[PDB]
Every structure is written in C-alpha cells, then in structure tokens.
Ligand binder design. Structure first.
Ligand SMILES: [Mg+2]
Ligand SMILES: [Mg+2]
Ligand SMILES: [Zn+2]
Lengths: 286, 154, 166, 294, 110, 150, 44, 221
C-alpha cells in the first residue's frame, strides 16, 4: 500500500468515467439538469435570434397539449383552478399557415417556371418533420419545449416550432417573420438538388407533358456518347432532341438510366432549378 | 517401402508376435469370444480359421496334433478342438469366426474388436442387420424385380 | 479469482408487455479447476460452438479426448438445469451460444534433468464455460456469392470522390 | 366465376376461419397425459396441452433425433400426423422409414408425394387453359410410381407433355421441396369442406364419398402453402423430407369419350432412403410405365 | 538450434486455429434402433454390447463353478438354460449351464 | 497524430451566417470557491468582468455558483448540444477573460482535424469534368474502326 | 447430410439382385459396340 | 448443521413451532355453503382463556379483521420482495414456503374482494412450557377473490393471469408467542383440504422421464 490520496482520487474519477461509458445513463431534459432558469432561458432565446418576442406569447408557444393533460393527471394523483394554461395549438396553426403561404410566395417569385405541384412539394419538404426538427433542435427549441415525453416526439417538436413562428407573427408582424422563415427554413435548400427534395417518378412522362404545354415537339432520345458497351462498367450519355435541337443530356451506366437522367436534366432546366442558377439573395431588402 | 508385406510387426519381434497371437488364440478357443485391440484380432483371425482346418484332419493325424500342441498353451483345449470345435464346423468350408469392431478402449482409446467362433452358446452379439425388405426403397426395387422377371418369361 | 459466470443466472428481467416478443431463455454454466489444458480444451469448446444441444452431445460422445467427457457432463447438467430452474419447455430446443475455456489456478513442480539441472513444470488446470440459449441453432451464414462481390465492388467504385481538390 | 388467384384466397380464408374456430373450443390450457409406448425411452409420460400439442411437441421433449427420424405417429394404434394436435390422453409411438414394418409410413409418404404433384399441376398451365383436379388414386408402393388423375382443358385434348415439359414439372416440385413447407392438417365436417371445394365438381363428389364412409361425416383436409386438398390419410410432416423427386410420365386414361382424364405420374425417395444415381435411373424407367390401381 | 525471435500471438493463432488443427465433425453417428442410444454406423452399439457382455460374464461365472478348477474344459457342447426351461431334444448330451433368471428377450433359444 | 485521431469536414451549424449570424454559445456555468486560493482569479472575474461580459452577450445565460471546490471550472454549452468543460484553476483574471471570449466565438463543433480548409456545396458552375468534356464528336457517332452501313 | 453408399439401405434380397442387374447391363452395353462399321462409322 | 456445539449454556432461541397443534379438518361440502360442535368449542374456549391470560385485552371478534390485514399485507410483500417487513408478518416456518420458490421470479398478486366474512374456526394453544414457551394458534377461514400472475426469470408469463379474479377458499393458521413480551400474531401455515379443487393448469407442457435403465436391467410393465 502506497501513501497518498491524490492518485487514488484521480483513479476513482477514471473508474467513474469508464463505468458511465459502459452503461450510458438514460437522457433527461435539460430543465431537469442543474443550472437552469426557465425565465432566463426564454429571454436568451429571443435575444440570440435578434427578435423582439412578447414573453407571454413565447411562453405559451412552448406549452403543448400533452404536457397540460399530464400535468393535470399528476395533480389528480396527488389530490391537489390554477392550471388554466393555454396550449400552443392556436399559435401553431397561425404559424403553420403563415409559413406555408410565405414559403409559397418566396418560391413562386424566385422560380416562376415551377408548376404548383413542384412548389407544393418544396414547401412540404421545408416544413416537413425532418427539416423542421433539425432546425428546432439546433435553436434550443427542444430545451424550452414543455412536453409529456422526452425525447420530444418529432410531431410535437414540429408543432412547437411553428407555434414560435406564430408568436413572432403576433409580436413583430409579417415582414419580420418572413425574414425569420428566410433565414432558418429557406436556407435548408442550400446544396439540395431539385429532385432530392421533390420526389418524382417517370420524369420522362412529366417532361413530355410539359413540352406539350409549351407547344414543343416530343423529345427524341439519341446516344451522344458511349464507352465500354460490352463490359460490366459501361458509360452512356443520352441526349434529348426537340426538332433536332439538344435540350438536355444525361449520363448513366445503362441507356435506360441515362435516358431517365437526361429527362431530369431537362426538367431542371425547364423549371429554373439548374445547379448553376443564380443563388438565393439573402441581402437586406432595399 | 512395404509393398506386399502381409504380416504386421507387433510385440518384441517375430517370435513374440507368434506368442502374442498364440495367447489370443488360446483364449478364443477356451472362451469362444474375446475382445482385444483391433489390429491384433485381425492378425490372429487368420490363424483361428486355419486351426479349425487342422482340427478337421482329426486327432490321429500326427501333424495336426503337433500343430495343436504348439498353438494351444492349455492342453485341455486340444480335446475341445478335435472333438467340439472341429465337428461343429463339419459342414462348413470356412468362415468359422466373426469379427466386429466395438467402441474404443477407455484407457488408451485403442481401436477394439470382438471375435468369436460361430455357433457358441453365449448370448448373441448385437449384429448389424440390413434394412427391412419392406422399406420404401426395397419395395420399389421388389416391384422392378417382379417386372423384369415377368418380361423375361414372356 | 473471479466467479462472474455463476452470477449471470441470477438476473431477473422485468415482465414483458403484451406486445413484446417472446424472450429466449439464457442459461450460464461452467466447471472450475479441470485437470486439463485450456489449449487442448479450446479445440473441444470450439467444436460444439453454435451447435444444437443434441448435436453437441453426439459429437462429444464419440470424441477420444479426455476433455470431451467433461464437457458432455457439463452440457447434460446445464440442459437439466434449464428445464428445471429456468422454465425451458423443451430440453432439445437449446443451442450452444457461447463455449470457451479459461486458464485455472496451476501448481508448480520440479522436473529433473541431467547434470544436476532442472525445469519447472506447471500442473495445468482450466475452466470450461458454456451458455445455452432457447431456440433452434441460428442458420449458418451462406458463403459470399459472385453477385454480392460484384455489388460491393461497384459500390466502392461509386463512393470514390475527387480527392485533394474543391 | 372467381379467378384462380381469388379462388385460393377464398379457400385459404375458409380454411383459416375453420382452424380458428376449432382452436376457440379449447377451454384455457386443459392438460392431457400421453404415455410413450415405444421400445426406446419406455415409460415416458408427456403432460401436454389438449388440441394444441402435437406428436412433434412430444418428440421435442425427447431429443432432436426423434424430431428428425419420426415421419408419422401411432396414436392409440392409429396413424397420426406429426403436426396434428392431440385431443385426448392416449398412448403414442413414433414411426420411421427404417422400421421393420414401415407400411403405414410408406403410404403417408406415398400420399404426400401425390399431393405435391397436384400442387405443381394446378399452377403450371397458362391461365388460358383450365386445370381440374380430380383425385390422387391410392396405388401400392410396389407399383413403382405415384399417380394423380387430372382433367385438362378441351383445348389441350391433343397435347402430350414433352420431355422438357416433364422436366419443368419436376423443377417446380423441387422448388416446393426447397421451400420446406409443413403439411398442415384439418379435420372438418363435410359441410365446411363442401363450401371450400364448391367450385370443383370432382372434389364435391370425392368429399361426399369420404363423408359417407365415416359416421360423423368429418373429412380430412390438408394444406401446403396456399394449396388445399382432400386426403385419404395421414401425411408426412414437411416437404423437405423428399430428396429425389421427378414427374415421370403423363398418361391418357381410357375410356376418353366422357372426359379425358390425364394420369400424371412420379416417383420419389426421402432423404433417409436416397438411392444411388444408377439405381435411381432404373426406378425412373419403371415409374414411366402406366399403373392400373386394383 | 534455438528460436531467433519470439513468435507472436498473431502468428501462433494462424497455426493453432488452422482448419487442419480443428476437430472435424463426425457424420456417421446414428441412433441404435434396439435401445435408442447413439452409435456409429460401423461400430457396435456401446449400450447393447455392454448388456450382452454382462450376461456373458454371469454365464462364464456359472461355467466356472461347474468346472471347479483349471484345465477342465469339457469335450461336449454347452447350452444355457433359464428358469422355467428344460433340455430340448437337441440339447441332450450337452453340458447344461443354468441361469437363475428369465430368458432375456434378445437371447432367443436355438 | 492524424491517423490516431478522428477527423471531420469544415462545416457550420444551420448554415450560420448565410441569412443571419447566431451566436452558438448558449450557456456558461461557473463554479467558484469563496475561500479557495485556486479560485482567486475566478472571484475577481466575477466582480468586474462577468457583469460587463453578460451585457455584451444577451443570448448567453451565465450561471455563477459559489460553492466549496478545489478546481474552479467553466462549462460551456452550445446550440448544437456540445458541452465543453474548461478548468480555470489558478488562472489570472485576464487569462479567464481570454478563455471565456474564445468560448463565446466557437461554434461548438469538435475541435479535431479538419480535412479541408474550405467547404462548398456548389464546386462547379460550368460542369464538372468528365472524360468526354474535351473530346470532339464524330459524324453518326461512329467508333474507331467501325464499318457503317454493311 | 450423412453420407451414403450404394447398398447402404438395400435389404438382403435386393443386394444380389442389384449386382446381377447392373452387371448384365454392363455386359450388354459392351456387346452392343462390337460392330462399329455397321453403325454409321466416320470416313476411313 | 443440525445441532450447534455441545455442552454450551447458550441455546437457539426459537420463535415458532413447525406444525399445527391440532389440525383443523374442515367439514366436507363447506365450499358449497358459501355434540361434537360443543366439544370442539369447549376446547377452543379453554385455549382462548390462556390466550387472554397473558394478553388481557384480546378479542376473538376483532381477530378475523386483523387476520385479513396480516394476510393481505404479507402477500403484498411478495410483489416487491419486502422481506424485512415480511418477517414481522409471518413466522419462520411460513417464510421459506412463501419466498424460496420465487427468488428469481416476479409475482404480481392482488386482493380484489372478500366474498364471505372471515370466521375463526378453531383456537388452540400449545402444551404449557414446551421449553418455557407457550404458543397460541388461531385457525381462520377465508373466502376471497384474488388475482395472481407469476412470471419467470425472463419476464415471461409462467402461471395465472394478471386481470382475472378467481375464488379462493383457504383456512390460514396464525400463531403467536404469548410468553414473549414482543410476540405478535403471524401467519403460521395453510391447511389444504383433501377435497379442495385442483389448482389451475400450468402454461407449459412437461415430460415425466421414464426409468433410466442400465444395460443389465430390463423394462417391466
Ligand atoms: Mg511396438
Ligand atoms: Mg545427481
Ligand atoms: Zn443399442
């Protein structure tokens, strides 16, 4: 046995790190952890975002129906009204409607050549659970969300996020909220390809109908390039020609794959979603 | 190289091999069933078959009596050979013994065999039996046989 | 010494919910201080690994090694223990999930050499460990086929980027 | 009438519905005592669950060897499918292909091979042509081939299968074996079966004959996958038992005037009794000859 | 000659776990139809063989008591008779060995 | 080490700075001793520096907890969920100010090897090179040594 | 999965019959080839 | 372990007996109701008196209510394995029988209703100063609805159902140490009538192995 306490203490700390790593503890809400003041956290949330929220509206936006029903069940179990707590349902609906109309206006003005179906799919992707939950989690919305279950269900988190938008709309108005939607939802299109957000089937069928609407002849498929035709790794470039004029060209490992890719390229050009299109303008409105 | 070498190398040399085989054969004649290492039983089985042939020559054949005197170390067994074992096989031309492999010996895991003179009074060994003629395969072959015999007579 | 293997049969799981699937039974058993080498015993524990309880018992019954008779004795008492204590319905519905050997506590003795020289011999001991799981033996993994090889090769050709540039 | 795909869906639903009904009759988990009367493991008693526990479950209590070698069960002296639920306290024995007298097992395997051929025949022809399953004649094993009487469309009245076609039927049979499907059994009243097989005239006549034979008018139904048929007796547990299987010949039965009944024929051997290539070829040749049930 | 270097565990595992070193699975095991215990196809059932040997030992002990000394092998054939049995016509002139038990079912009188 | 450690690509949190800049530092938790000598510099930072630092960063909630401790620590938490603990043991007031300001400016991503000193989602405007980019086309797309109209 | 050989499952009665059957076929096949020039030979 | 060291002044201090002093056999057909009577009653009255001797303020009328509370609380300890509190509610004879078989099992038991009020069927006392200790045993009759759902070590339902109440007629015997100043009334054992209906069947199937015969041995009918 060696004299001393420092080495033993240090080894205890390491034994406690290893024990925790072997059995990671079940996660808990940040509010349940130490160093939490809800009122201070609410105020910082608005200040981080450079938004002049109304603290009464902002707090209600975080209150969910599930948290109210469970809070009452706990009250009944303990035999304990003062729980006249308003949910975020009304704010959620207002924010959801505004976001959809606002995103539709942003996208219609930017890409006038996209049909309504495409714009609707883009709005559905931007306001979908996956995108909205990612943005909400990285804006501390989940920490401030009052929910019955933790981790907060994705549908609940999405509802809370749009409730916060509703609170902003009442607090600051449509113009200020539109900038918020531009800076945290429109940005989520960065790098995305058109058909990575708008999931379509049979692009050639869609292309033929669009060209008919434009009074353009049906596209003829032709082989522009070819390599390794008889091998296990072919390359094909299929070009689509309208009146013997090239509209689009697409590569693929098979002629069928190359042709379908060429149709997608034609659709991207027709709708103004080319990879090299003018980037979205985030500059302050004049 | 051991091409065409029909005899095993056992014991301490050629003489000891014969003595080892003789003691086994003497045990077999007395008890009519013995168990021993498989290789040694296989070696001795040839001698046990030929001993019966000498016994069939009769106790008046001096050559047969000398052979029996050498191979049977217990002399009460010589009357048994000429008067019990050899008469029992009077109507056979061979196949006096049966040799079957038994589970490996416990101590040294040696391969083991049981050998007996057929027609002894001891409880019968659990001999291997071929599948019944009533099995699916054997019935399908019986039909094929019946069919072939009918076509030949026609 | 450590004796954690004997404590794994004392874990009590919470009752399952109505919708959850049937949880297979797990039975841990071992034998300590076997007068046999862990290196030789490893070849026997490796043999029955993954087998059914009845196939493992059949292979060990006709093996000539001394460890075979010891493992078979451990498997029989783990089979009986499974049905009697661990609520296993069918005694044949078991397979060898884990089976290995471990070094035991050994003794040292002198081995005499010529010229007044000597060596130290270890009188070796080993442990044998087995884990039985309720159910049929998991099917063996089929060997990789040409279609899978080509599919993986093309997948590597499609995952390659332009390195050290924009 | 119903399409072929819809007809199977209807029959399976009726089969499943009747199976569920019989299961509901069982109150909680009543217990039966099944005594083993076999030569080995003498005196073993199985305390099993009435109408749920099958002979196979009793084999599972013994060892894997019983489960692999047991092809049929002898329940109170009566041949019993391995997957047929036991209904009462009784005595049980297990039968293998290699028993001294495997006559009952041979018939069970012999009947199941015919039922697998019917499944192949019904699903092989193009949708244009109509296939009407008739019956599986009970022919002795020594006859050399198992046979199944079928009636084909009038369009195929001058068509005889080619060797490649016969090989195509065999490849379909071997896919059924590879699927390793259990032979599910159901003993239902004549009324239930008559509803299942209403669309087929031959089955209705066959079902009526079987019901008349038995005082309680219960008919034995079997199913493999999605194919349901009416049987003469107990069947083998699974289709994986078959190892060598080939549809040998198709004969046109006489008289042909009323209807042209085509006798499809095959021969098979289980895994336990598989034959050498040379011997198997000789059995295939005799199987190709016409068998006349007596 | 002595090792120039210690052999690594990586190298040693390749040698020790090479398929040539592993125990091979036996495919010739089967159930004995008489007793249900396991046997190899080419080898007599261990359970049945032991049963035969045990009865054989009892008969040989009885033969000893009748002979009552070394070098007393008879010059006539022998028959084993069990309780409730009497010498047959073909058992006359043969040494009778009497066993105090019932004839085993597997021991058919011939 | 590079081979002995993990790596990542240059990235941001929610495309920060594209539409607007959002400070990623969200919370600061100080643990100062009232009497410990090792907390002398931390006590002086709480008397004159922390209040002015909070005025400049209204989006960061600072939690100062005075309790017995041998090693005073500051715990920084970021919007992406990263948690960073930094000891201020025996540090001067100026040293602590520098550390706290650094925590304020960091994104919260792992401080590990960054493979590339740049990131872009649109590396090409004119079309990424492929083997046919600079190859001419031939009449009827005929291959080398290919007989036409045979 | 256990290996088998040609007479493993054959009964006492069927082993001689099978031996005779295959033997006769072997002899018949060899006798059927004794006249190559009467059986469409290739050009000499 | 049967006896500690010899020639020791200290001895083992037992707090309970192993059996019922005079086993109460319940009349046949009692489940349906759901001279000798006096003789049995007189024996109970005598025994009751020596119970009221050591403890003056004892009421037979109050016991059946107390007995039910002891019973319910004792069985509730099995649900949470509250073994420290169980020793106060049951004797050392009862404790092994209750807990030994459930050490690695989960028992979910509940009390639903009492169909018939509990009736003190018999009261009896031990022979005075067995070893300086006198014990009083009070047999009680309980007709109540209970729910039991035992699980195995892997959380799989092993016996009973968790929501279906079933009728239970069981005559629980209690026992107290009258001489001991801190003695209390504690569930001592259970009387199982021979005519009692068979228990509900278990879920799993069982195999009863036949005789394991050595090669020399043969199987007999
Ligand atoms: Mg030697
Ligand atoms: Mg010396
Ligand atoms: Zn046997």
């Amino acid at each position: 046995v060696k004299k001393g306490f420092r080495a033993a203490f240090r080894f205890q700390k390491e034994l406690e790190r290893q024990r925790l790593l072997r059995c990671p503890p079940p996660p808990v809400r940040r509010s349940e952890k130490p160093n939490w003041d809800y009122h201070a956290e609410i105020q910082a949330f608005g200040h981080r975002l450079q938004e002049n929220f109304s603290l009464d509206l902002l707090k209600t936006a975080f209150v969910n129906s599930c948290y109210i029903k469970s809070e009452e069940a706990k009250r009944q179990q303990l035999g304990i009204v003062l729980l006249n707590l308003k949910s975020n349902q009304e704010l959620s609906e207002q924010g959801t409607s505004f976001s959809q109309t606002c995103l539709t206006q942003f996208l219609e003005d930017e890409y006038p050549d996209m049909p309504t179906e495409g714009i609707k799919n883009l709005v559905d992707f931007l306001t979908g659970e996956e995108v909205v939950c990612h943005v909400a989690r990285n804006l501390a919305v989940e920490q401030l969300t009052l929910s019955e279950e933790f981790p907060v269900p994705p549908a609940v988190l999405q509802q809370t996020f749009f409730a916060v938008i509703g609170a902003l709309l009442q607090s600051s108005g449509p113009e200020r909220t539109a900038l918020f939607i531009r800076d945290f939802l429109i940005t989520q299109m960065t790098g995305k390809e058109l058909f990575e957000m708008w999931k379509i089937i049979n692009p050639m069928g869609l292309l033929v109908e669009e060209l008919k609407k434009r009074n353009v002849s049906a596209p003829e498929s032709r082989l522009t390039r070819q390599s390794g035709g008889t091998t296990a790794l072919p390359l094909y470039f299929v070009g689509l020609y309208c009146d013997k004029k090239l509209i689009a060209e697409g590569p693929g490992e098979t002629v069928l794959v190359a042709e379908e890719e060429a149709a997608r390229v034609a659709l991207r050009k027709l709708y103004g979603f080319t990879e090299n299109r003018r980037p979205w303008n985030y500059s302050k409105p004049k | 190289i051991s091409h065409g070498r029909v005899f095993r190398r056992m014991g301490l040399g050629p003489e000891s091999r014969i003595h080892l085989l003789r003691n086994l054969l003497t045990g077999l004649v007395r008890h009519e069933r013995i168990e021993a290492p498989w290789a040694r039983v296989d070696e001795m089985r040839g001698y046990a078959e030929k001993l019966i042939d000498y016994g069939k020559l009769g106790d008046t054949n001096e050559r047969a009596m000398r052979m029996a005197d050498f191979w049977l170390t217990e002399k009460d067994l010589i009357p048994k050979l000429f008067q019990v074992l050899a008469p029992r096989y009077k109507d056979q031309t061979g196949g006096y013994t049966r040799m079957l492999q038994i589970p490996n010996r416990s101590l040294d895991r040696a391969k083991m065999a049981v050998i007996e003179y057929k027609g002894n009074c001891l409880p019968p060994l659990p001999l291997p039996r071929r599948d019944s003629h009533l099995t699916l395969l054997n019935q399908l072959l019986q039909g094929l046989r019946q069919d072939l015999r009918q076509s030949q007579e026609a | 010494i450590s004796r954690k293997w004997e404590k794994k049969n004392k874990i009590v799981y919470p009752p399952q919910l109505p919708g959850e699937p049937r949880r297979p039974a797990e039975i841990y058993h071992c034998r300590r201080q076997i007068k046999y080498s862990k290196d030789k015993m490893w070849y026997l524990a490796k043999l029955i690994r993954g087998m059914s309880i009845d196939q493992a018992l059949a292979q060990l019954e006709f093996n000539d090694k001394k460890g075979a008779k010891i493992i078979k004795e451990v498997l029989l008492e783990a089979q009986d223990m499974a049905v009697r204590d661990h609520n296993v319905e069918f005694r044949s519905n078991l397979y060898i999930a884990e089976s290995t050997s471990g070094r035991g506590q050994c003794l040292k003795r002198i081995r005499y050499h010529g010229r007044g020289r000597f060596g130290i011999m270890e009188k070796v001991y080993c442990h044998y460990f087995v884990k039985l799981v309720e159910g049929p033996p998991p099917p063996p993994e089929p060997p990789k086929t040409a279609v899978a090889h080509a599919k993986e090769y093309i997948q590597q050709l499609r995952s390659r980027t332009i390195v050290h540039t924009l | 009438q119903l399409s072929p795909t819809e007809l199977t869906e209807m029959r399976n639903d009726l089969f499943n519905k009747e199976k569920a009904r019989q299961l509901s009759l069982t109150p909680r988990t009543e217990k039966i005592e099944v005594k083993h009367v076999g030569k080995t493991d003498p005196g073993t008693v199985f305390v099993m669950n009435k109408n749920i526990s099958t002979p196979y479950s009793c084999a599972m209590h013994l060892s894997e060897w019983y489960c692999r070698k047991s092809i049929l069960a002898l329940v109170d002296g009566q041949p019993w499918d391995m997957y047929k639920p036991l209904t009462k306290s009784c005595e049980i024995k297990f039968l293998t292909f290699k028993d001294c007298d495997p006559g009952e097992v041979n018939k069970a395997y012999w009947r199941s091979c015919a039922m697998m051929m019917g499944c192949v025949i019904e699903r092989a022809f193009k949708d244009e042509y109509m296939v009407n399953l008739v019956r599986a004649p009970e022919v002795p094993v020594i006859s050399g081939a198992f046979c199944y009487d079928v009636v084909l469309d009038s369009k195929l009245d001058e068509w005889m299968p080619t060797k490649e076609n016969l090989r195509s039927f065999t490849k379909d049979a071997h896919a059924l074996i590879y699927k390793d499907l259990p032979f599910e059994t159901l003993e239902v009243e004549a009324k239930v079966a008559l509803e299942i097989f209403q669309h087929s005239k031959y089955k209705v006549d066959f079902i009526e004959e079987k019901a008349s034979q038995n005082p309680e008018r219960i008919v034995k139904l079997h199913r493999i996958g999605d194919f349901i048929d009416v049987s003469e007796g107990p069947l083998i547990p699974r289709t994986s038992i078959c190892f060598q299987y080939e549809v040998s010949a198709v004969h046109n039965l006489q008289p042909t005037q009323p209807s042209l009944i085509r006798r499809f024929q095959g021969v098979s051997l289980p895994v336990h009794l598989r034959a050498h290539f040379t011997i198997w070829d000789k059995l295939l040749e005799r199987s190709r000859k016409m068998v006349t049930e007596d | 000659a002595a090792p120039k270097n210690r052999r690594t565990i990586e190298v040693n595992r390749c040698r020790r776990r090479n398929p040539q070193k592993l125990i091979k699975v036996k495919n010739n095991i089967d159930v004995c139809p008489e007793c249900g215990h396991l046997k190899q196809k080419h080898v007599l059932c261990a359970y049945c063989y032991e049963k035969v040997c045990k009865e054989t030992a009892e008969i040989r002990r009885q033969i000893g008591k009748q002979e009552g000394g070394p070098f007393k092998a008879p010059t006539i054939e022998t028959v084993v008779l069990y309780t409730g049995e009497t010498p047959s016509e073909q058992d006359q002139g043969k040494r009778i060995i009497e066993r105090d038990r019932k004839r085993p079912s597997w021991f058919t009188q011939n | 080490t590079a081979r002995g450690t993990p790596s990542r690509f240059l990235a941001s949190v929610l495309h920060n700075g594209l539409g607007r800049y959002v400070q990623q530092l969200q919370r600061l938790s100080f643990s100062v001793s009232r009497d410990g000598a090792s907390s002398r510099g931390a006590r002086e930072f709480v008397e004159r520096e922390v209040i002015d630092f909070a005025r400049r960063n209204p989006g960061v909630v600072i939690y100062v907890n005075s309790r017995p401790c041998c090693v005073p620590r500051v715990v920084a938490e970021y919007l992406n969920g990263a948690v960073r603990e930094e000891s201020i043991h025996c540090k001067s007031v100026e040293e602590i100010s520098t550390l706290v300001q650094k925590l304020a400016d960091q994104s919260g991503l792992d401080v590990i090897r960054i493979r590339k000193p740049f990131h872009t989602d649109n590396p090409s405007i004119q079309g990424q090179w492929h083997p046919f980019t600079n190859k001419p086309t031939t009449f009827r797309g005929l291959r080398p040594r290919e007989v036409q109209d045979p | 999965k256990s290996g088998t050989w040609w007479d493993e499952h054959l009964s006492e009665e069927n082993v001689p019959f099978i031996k005779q059957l295959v033997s006769d076929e072997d002899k018949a096949q060899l006798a059927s080839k004794l006249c190559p020039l009467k059986d469409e030979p290739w050009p000499i | 372990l049967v006896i500690p060291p010899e020639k020791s002044d200290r001895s083992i201090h037992l707090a309970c007996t192993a059996g019922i002093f005079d086993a109460y056999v319940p009349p046949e057909g009692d489940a349906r109701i759901s001279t000798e009577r006096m003789k049995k009653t007189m024996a109970s009255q005598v025994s009751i008196r020596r119970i009221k001797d050591y403890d003056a303020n004892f009421k037979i009328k109050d016991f059946p209510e107390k007995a039910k509370d002891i019973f319910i609380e004792a069985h509730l300890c099995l649900n949470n394995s509250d073994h420290d509190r169980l020793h106060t509610l049951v004797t050392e004879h009862c404790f092994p029988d209750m807990t030994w078989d459930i050490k690695y099992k989960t028992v979910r038991w509940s009390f639903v209703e009492s169909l018939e009020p509990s009736h003190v069927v018999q009261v009896r006392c031990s022979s005075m100063m067995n070893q300086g200790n006198v014990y009083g045993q009070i047999t009680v009759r309980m007709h109540t609805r209970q729910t039991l759902a035992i699980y195995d070590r892997f959380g799989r339902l092993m016996y009973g159902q968790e929501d279906v109440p079933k009728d239970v007629l069981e005559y629980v015997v209690f026992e107290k140490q009258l001489t001991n100043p801190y003695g209390s009334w504690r569930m001592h054992t259970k009387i199982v009538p021979p005519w009692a209906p068979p228990k509900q069947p278990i879920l799993k199937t069982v195999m009863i192995p036949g005789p394991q015969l050595k090669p020399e041995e043969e199987y007999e009918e």
